[PDB]
Write a protein that binds this ligand. Structure first.
Ligand code: CL
Ligand code: CL
Ligand code: NA
Length: 213
């Protein structure tokens, strides 16, 4: 059985149905235990929460999902009428994410889109998306830059749209950080989470779009 299947089984066995906090804790506990991800709730979850609270988005796009942790984390904060779109190419991960949201009682806040972002971002207009208020870029860091370009080119960003990208500790290729920092179209903030230690545990980049030039 896959890691993601085992994460779901553990939630099913230990978390309280319809309780997002219990789901998040159960995922966090099991992953920290297995040394798969260290205290995601403190390293990335709190930054996710504060960005969402700071900008109060009505429409969020999540690019990338694995076991549904991030989708639950975000959907649990959205106000009535606010919605999360979660786009993921791998149907197994999308299926776990769906079941995790069902278990948490958050399925009515989320639309899961299964497919490649190159195919689906240009079709977001068909989901009644004019522009996005926030984008969370997760897991597949080599997609961050090309996905950002596609969002720009499809007119899905407006002045004030917030991009938040996870796991940007080291430069990679394609280099998302160099693009958003270099461009005068994005105002950027870097977050480094150390937890109680001296070494970075997770790094995130917030890039706020200044509007089309
Ligand atoms: Cl905040
Ligand atoms: Cl996830
Ligand atoms: Na910039």
């Amino acid at each position: 059985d896959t890691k993601e299947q085992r994460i779901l089984r553990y939630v099913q066995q230990h978390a309280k149905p319809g309780d997002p906090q219990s789901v998040l804790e159960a995922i966090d506990t099991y992953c920290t235990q297995k040394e798969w991800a260290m205290n995601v709730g403190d390293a990335k979850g709190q930054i996710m929460d504060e960005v969402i609270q700071e900008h109060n988005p009505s429409l969020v796009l999540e690019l990338g999902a694995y076991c549904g942790y991030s989708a639950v984390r975000m959907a649990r904060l959205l106000s009535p009428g606010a919605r999360l779109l979660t786009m993921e190419k791998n149907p197994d991960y999308a299926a776990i994410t769906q079941q995790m949201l069902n278990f948490a009682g958050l399925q009515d806040k989320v639309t899961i889109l299964i497919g490649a972002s190159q195919d689906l971002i240009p079709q977001l207009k068909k989901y009644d998306v004019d522009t996005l208020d926030m984008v969370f870029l997760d897991h597949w860091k080599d997609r961050y830059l090309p996905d950002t370009i596609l969002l720009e080119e499809c007119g899905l960003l407006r002045k004030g749209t917030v991009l938040l990208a996870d796991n940007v500790i080291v430069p990679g290729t394609p280099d998302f950080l160099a693009y958003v920092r270099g461009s005068s179209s994005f105002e950027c903030t870097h977050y480094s989470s150390y937890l109680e230690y001296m070494k970075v545990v997770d790094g995130l980049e917030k890039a706020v779009y200044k509007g089309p030039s």
